[PDB]
Design a protein that fits this description.
Blueprint: E1 2-4, H1 6-14, E2 20-25, H2 30-45, E3 51-56, H3 61-66, E4 74-79, E5 82-88, H4 93-103
Parallel strand pairs: 1-3, 2-3
Antiparallel strand pairs: 2-4, 4-5
PDB class: electron transport
Keywords: Thioredoxin, electron transport
Assembly: monomeric
């Protein structure tokens, strides 16, 4: 999965036509380590429907600030370059599917 930084955000999220969910992550986060395989399993199922990417705290300070994202990991779904929903914390595979499909 691609990792994005603040410098990529305008192009890849605000300007890009296709939906994207960003998992915000960090180096010292056990919960993030266990959720990665789930996020990546979901990415594989939804390929060509929704894009999936990471943003590490160290590279996404400005993005996290303006989206007021603290909890880690966090998920942020964008549609038409606009924020749809932000989830704070971990999800198992079934809750993740429900969250995505219910929000698009």
């Amino acid at each position: 999965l691609r990792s994005l930084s603040d410098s990529d955000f305008q192009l890849e999220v605000r300007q890009h036509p296709d939906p994207i969910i960003i998992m915000f992550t960090g180096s010292w986060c056990q919960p993030c380590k266990k959720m990665k395989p789930t996020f990546e399993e979901m990415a594989s199922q939804m390929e060509g429907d929704i894009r999936f990417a990471y943003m590490d705290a160290e590279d996404a300070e400005k993005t996290m600030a303006e989206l007021n994202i603290r909890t880690l990991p966090s998920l942020a779904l964008f549609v038409d370059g606009m924020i749809r929903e932000v989830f704070s914390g971990t999800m198992n595979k079934s809750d993740l599917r429900y969250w995505i499909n219910n929000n698009i």
